[PDB]
Amino acid sequence: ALPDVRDGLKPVHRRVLYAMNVLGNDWNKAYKKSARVVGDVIGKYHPHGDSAVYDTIVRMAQPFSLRYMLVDGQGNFGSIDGDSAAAMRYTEIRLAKIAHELMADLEKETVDFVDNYDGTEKIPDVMPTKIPNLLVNGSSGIAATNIPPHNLTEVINGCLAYIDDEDISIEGLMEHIPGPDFPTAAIINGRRGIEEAYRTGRGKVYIRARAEVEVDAKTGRETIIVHEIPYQVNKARLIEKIAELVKEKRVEGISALRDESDKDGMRIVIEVKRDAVGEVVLNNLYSQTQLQVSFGINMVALHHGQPKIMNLKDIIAAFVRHRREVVTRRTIFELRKARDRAHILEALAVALANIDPIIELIRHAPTPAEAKTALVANPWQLGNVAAMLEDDAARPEWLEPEFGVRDGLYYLTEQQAQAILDLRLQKLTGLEHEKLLDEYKELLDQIAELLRILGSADRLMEVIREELELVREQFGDKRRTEIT
Amino acid sequence: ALPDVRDGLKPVHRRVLYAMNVLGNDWNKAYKKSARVVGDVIGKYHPHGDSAVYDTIVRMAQPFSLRYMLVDGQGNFGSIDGDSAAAMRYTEIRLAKIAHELMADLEKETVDFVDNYDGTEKIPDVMPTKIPNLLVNGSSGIAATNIPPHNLTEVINGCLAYIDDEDISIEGLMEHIPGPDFPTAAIINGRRGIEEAYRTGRGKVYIRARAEVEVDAKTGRETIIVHEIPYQVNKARLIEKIAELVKEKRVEGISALRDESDKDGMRIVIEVKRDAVGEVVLNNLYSQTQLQVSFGINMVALHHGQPKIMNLKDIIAAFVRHRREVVTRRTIFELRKARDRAHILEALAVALANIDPIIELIRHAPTPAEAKTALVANPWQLGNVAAMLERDDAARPEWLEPEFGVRDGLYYLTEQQAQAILDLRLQKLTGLEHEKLLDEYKELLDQIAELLRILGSADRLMEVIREELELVREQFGDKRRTEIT
């Protein structure tokens, strides 16, 4: 599958993250065993093999795999030497903080949902992401796409620059986004390959290990130290290949080879023979090993449901258009939700102002259906809530004109009558009664504010911008990969 | 793992069935995709490989594997030829009706629960089963136990005969349970091996295919037809072994071999050469192939947490003792639950009889806490529910202190009763809803009296147990399949 251009996710990734969200497997709550999330995914969303689901989770937790990890893992999640993760019953996971930004406002009718595999559950078609995840975490797929990861600060600055100037050039965007940024650091060589990829969607660059020749001050002997290796290279396999080249005499001048890497960092030590030149040995290692690799940037993603080759500007534009859709839908949802709640609260307020006749009516009703019928049959006096209740701004858009406040009287709907019948006796106490009235007044202010936002293109675009700025403050970090 | 003697299950089976129960994957509801159950099991109860969990589900659904299937499956669940089941996202399952009897009263504090693997969930240690599942479905394990399956009517009869007479002999039990009964029918040969296994826990019997020699009336040519094969034999493997023996000339006289089995039944056809004798060919096949197999009965199960070799009476006695424990626990639970509910209903009835002062009190309380305080501070007149409430003390919860409840024509509420009043919805004031609460109270008083009779009498307890076993026999008992010779 190709990633969606808007959230950077393939279905399997989206299913995992959604399952974690539904479970409440939050960044600020206790870790859960990986098996619990796997079992949920398998059962409800991705019924295709515990090991493939668990592999997805593992990869999302590994700091050498994802530039911004989506899963916060505790335990053994494998290594850059290709060691396996521990079994899913042993490792523990929760959502990374940044994953919550990928899923912000999911409950606010911001994205379309589709059926799961058996038609018993709903799954988001795309996440309502505040993070430009496709660019920052990248994607690959060989069945094809190959998008490298990027620095979040840089990409947010590029998004804001596009919002400021929709005609910005690729050169203009590259002042903010000079190239990829790998979790594994190292060096990118080929500035024109970057530019070609950003302009056209395709370009080839080379990634090189950070390695130096050291000279021992007392003896003059040379040692090559490798500090950082290219993205997606397996360190153990790299060291084995070097040993094989030394054995076959395809690379000369190496007296010893040792991995001294540990928890604190990578350190591959290659000692140079006294009669060899360190720089020459190192150059031969770059030409014959994965100390240098090519990376064919191929920026293909799903856009309006179809596979598309996309340039840097196309990708940014799609993300920003997604934010516009999300924020507009979210604000419409909040307005609807507030109007619906205010509508119920009007009924409860009117009922509580008429508590004596309401009780009398209900007590003498043979059944709840007959009580509901009696509640809606005649309108109610407003009493001391007249001023509070008497703009049509708070009325739900679906409410017919025969209902609500009309000439000093309240005409209830059957659903309002049901809300009255559902009122608990404890709502008659002073504090509970007052809380309902206060909530109504707050909702009126919230409705007015939401209408001001929906009425103003400037307000809406500002909400989009400010959300991007906040992401940069909360999650932006330093560049790791040097571009040459 | 060894199965528990009481429910016949190993942990993995118990975790699967419990997950289905918790999901509401009931016999009378829509089928669910197998993957849904597998995912629940992996997540909460058995975090060890989707294929192993699914393999357990699948076996529990196969009519050639289980004498009484515990899972009702729809879709391809494999075959007697060893075909694999379809993938878990394309098969559908729910609990078999009889599985609900295995788990009857699980929600009634009838069995101990233990922690799952991560300490976040509880799992029953054993099922509160109304079915003697160890005997009827059997068990095997090689890491050792080997218990064949048995006919449920027969086994229930044996249980009832033990209840009637605790000193019944093995011979007495065998009048009801003459031997094993395989899902796959066929024939058992070795009556003394059965008796040895029932008396001691161990004995060897032989299982033989049902096969006949047919003669063609017009031509005289003979054909062997195999109708039924021994339990746990793979039909395809059997046919291959026969072909190999014919090829190597270790069995002579066979001109053709064909599997003509289909949906309607098994039919393996072995044509006999004109110059060979059918009966002689068939006897040679019984001596060299799985048309006949041994079955080493080895009745080992977990009893009071330890492995032990158990004879037929030991197993029956353990099942009946389990029923006594389950029914006693269930009755205690139901009594507590009914008293707790009756206690809440008294409060609601008294409040509804005092609706005007109750409303005045609440309206003038600043908060729900202060309303609760006011409700409990002083007692309430009983009004028209005096007769209903006063009438024993039989309905009082055992934990209720004497300062509470009905006292000298007045009702003294607890804080929890007051909370129940404050939680009442306005719709409960209607005539119908009010009447339903009063009717429920009166039903509870009758239920309480009946539960007290059970707890007060060992005879009444055993009568409950006996009647439950009789009902299982009536609902699920079926005909014997395997012929004993």
Author numbering:
A (entry chain C): 33 to 175, 179 to 425, 429 to 522
B (entry chain A): 33 to 175, 179 to 426, 429 to 522
How do the authors describe this structure?
DNA gyrase is the only type II topoisomerase capable of catalyzing DNA supercoiling, in a reaction driven by ATP hydrolysis. DNA gyrase consists of two subunits, GyrA and GyrB (97 kDa and 90 kDa, respectively, in Escherichia coli), forming an A2B2 complex in the active enzyme. The N-terminal domain of GyrB is the site of ATP hydrolysis, while DNA cleavage and strand passage occur at the interface between the C-terminal domain of GyrB and the N-terminal domain of GyrA. A new GyrA NTD fragment was constructed with a view of obtaining a crystal structure of SD8 bound to GyrA in an alternative conformation that would be representative of the situation at lower ligand concentrations. This smaller 55-kDa NTD fragment of GyrA (GyrA55), comprising residues 30–522 of the 875-amino-acid wild-type sequence (compared with residues 2–522 for GyrA59), crucially lacks residues spanning Leu17 to Asp23 that have been identified as providing 10 of the 12 protein–protein hydrogen bonds responsible for stabilizing the tetramer at the dimer–dimer interface in the crystal structure of the GyrA59–SD8 complex.
Comparisons within this structure reveal some conformational flexibility, with overall RMSD values up to 1.28 Å for monomer–monomer superpositions and up to 1.37 Å for dimer–dimer superpositions. Superposition of each homodimer with a homodimer generated from the apoGyrA59 crystal structure (which has a single monomer in the ASU) gives RMSD values of 0.87 and 1.20 Å, indicating that there is less variation across these two structures than within the apoGyrA55 structure. Additionally, there are a number of side-chain rearrangements around the SD8-binding site, but most of these are relatively minor, the exception being Arg91, which is disordered in the apoGyrA55 structure, with either no clear density for the guanidinium group and/or high temperature factors in each of the four monomers, suggesting that it is highly mobile in the absence of SD8. The structures presented in this work fit with the group of type II topoisomerase structures that have a closed exit gate and no DNA bound; that is, they are consistent with the existing structures. In addition, we have also presented the high-resolution structure of apoGyrA55 that has allowed us to describe specific conformational changes brought on by the action of SD8 binding to gyrase.
